[PDB]
Amino acid sequence: ERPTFYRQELNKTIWEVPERYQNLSPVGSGAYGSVCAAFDTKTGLRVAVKKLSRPFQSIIHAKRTYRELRLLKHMKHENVIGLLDVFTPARSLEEFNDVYLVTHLMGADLNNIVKCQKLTDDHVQFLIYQILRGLKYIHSADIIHRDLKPSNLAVNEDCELKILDFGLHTDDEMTGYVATRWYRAPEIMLNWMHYNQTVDIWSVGCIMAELLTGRTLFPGTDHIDQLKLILRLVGTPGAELLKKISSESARNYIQSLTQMPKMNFANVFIGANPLAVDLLEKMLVLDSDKRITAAQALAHAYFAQYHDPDDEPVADPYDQSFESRDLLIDEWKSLTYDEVISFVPPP
Ligand SMILES: Cc1ccc(C(=O)NC2CC2)cc1-c1ccc(C(=O)NCC2CC2)cn1
């Protein structure tokens, strides 16, 4: 039956949540809503509670809301954020208008870790191993992160990690000297072609490089500057990659550039474990068809001390046919409502 809900104003909005959640405290906007840390008295867990703002304002928001809930209801892996609870104060479809998502709360993100701790190579191994283990699971359900960066990698005090914000920025956001663009595969930064899950491996390459050196790998001041930094390191594209760039416009620009050889990674990453250098070479490949995959990378010798092939699970089939569907707001809202009401807590 239905819990009792109580009301409070947080972030100049009214938050209405079940009594089990106490000591709500704002933690800083999340994807499509604001988030509060809270104490879940029922489980004894520190949780994060996201209130979607205007979930059913438009078709875009309504589909968006359904998308996020579906994604969260499906993911059940130690290295991927999952759904602890989802609720609405509404007693019926008619009054259903607010959606709250509850997940684990981690004490830091990877951006905090990289900024204020010294990471040994063993830390680099473990952290990257977990990101690759989570991505294998995500990629197996045909989900692409597309925006993997240190700020959406949550980490507990034991250095155990979860991936957030997969499967869901404007132009201004990607503009200038900004982390929102530093980890993006070039094919997506410059819209070269229909991209796919390989975009996430480039992002991992960029994060791993940064854990090893403490410094952003390609901190471009804009898209062009960033492309120049990238090509300086990995070489300009060859004939075969070029043909695959289906944007005639992008192909044309990139061919205007002076050809440059790929650099020696052992010279760029002095002191680094040679195995780490090898994996960076396999991840940081301009041609997405030729980058190592998450499943392949887990078997790389850099991860010998963590790799366990019987303990790197794939996901249950994820039906995302809804993605190609056009529906009205009320249709997306009712679909969402069914998913709220049919939620079953993890055990
Ligand atoms: C509450 C919530 C709802 C949805 C998604 C999400 O990933 N949705 C996309 C996947 C569909 C993520 C969160 C979440 C989880 C943990 C943290 C956290 O630990 N914050 C504290 C920060 C890390 C220091 C912050 N936010």
How far is it, in rounded angstroms, from Cα 84 to Cα 101?
8
C-alpha–C-alpha distance, residues 17 and 35, integer Å: 13
Cα-flanking dihedrals φ and ψ of residue 21, to 5°?
Answer: -95, 115
Query: Any residues with Cβ below 6 Å from ligand 1, and which?
Result: 27, 30-31, 35, 48, 50, 68, 71-72, 81, 101, 103, 105-106, 108-109, 154, 164-168
Give the CA diameter of the chain. Answer: 68
Q: Which two tokens stand for residue 44?
A: 């004894």
Q: Dihedral of the CA atoms 121, 236, 197, 159 (nearest 10)? A: 20
Virtual torsion, Cα 278, 283, 284, 288, nearest 10 deg: 140
Instruction: Tell me which residue of 268, 243, 231 sits closest to 193, measured CA to CA.
Output: 243
Q: What is the DSSP string of 127-162?
A: HHHHHHHHHHHHHHTT---S---GGGEEE-TT--EE
Backbone angle region of 18, left / alpha / beta, with phi > 0 → left and psi within -120 to 50 → alpha: beta
Quoted resolution (Å): 2.1
> How far apart (Å, rounded) are the C-alpha atoms in residues 175 and 103?
31
Domains in the chain, CATH or no CATH each: 15-107 (3.30.200.20), 108-314 (1.10.510.10)
Burial 244-274 (b: 16+ CB within 10 A, else e): ebeeeebbeebeeeeeeeeeebeeebeebee
Are 57 and 41 in contact by the 8 Å Cβ rule? The answer is no
Classify residue 167 as exposed, middle or buried by CB count within 10 Å of its CB (0-12, 13-18, 19+).
Answer: buried
The response to whether 314 counts as a known ligand-binding position is no
Say which experimental method was used: X-ray
Choice among 98, 165, 200, 338 that is catalytic: 165
Q: Is 86 helix (H, G, I), strand (E, B) or coil?
A: strand
Sheet of 85-87: strands edge to edge? 21-26, 33-40, 45-52, 100-104, 85-87
**Dihedral class, residue 45 (left if φ above 0, else alpha if ψ from -120 to 50, else beta):** beta
Is 277 annotated among the ligand-binding residues?
no
Q: Give start and end residues of each alpha helix (H) in the chain.
A: 59-74, 110-116, 121-140, 171-174, 179-182, 186-189, 198-213, 223-234, 239-244, 248-255, 265-268, 274-283, 294-298, 329-341
> From the CA atom positions of the chain, what is the Rg in Å?
21
Catalytic residue status for 165: yes
CA-based nearest residue to 126, from 78, 81, 84, 167: 78
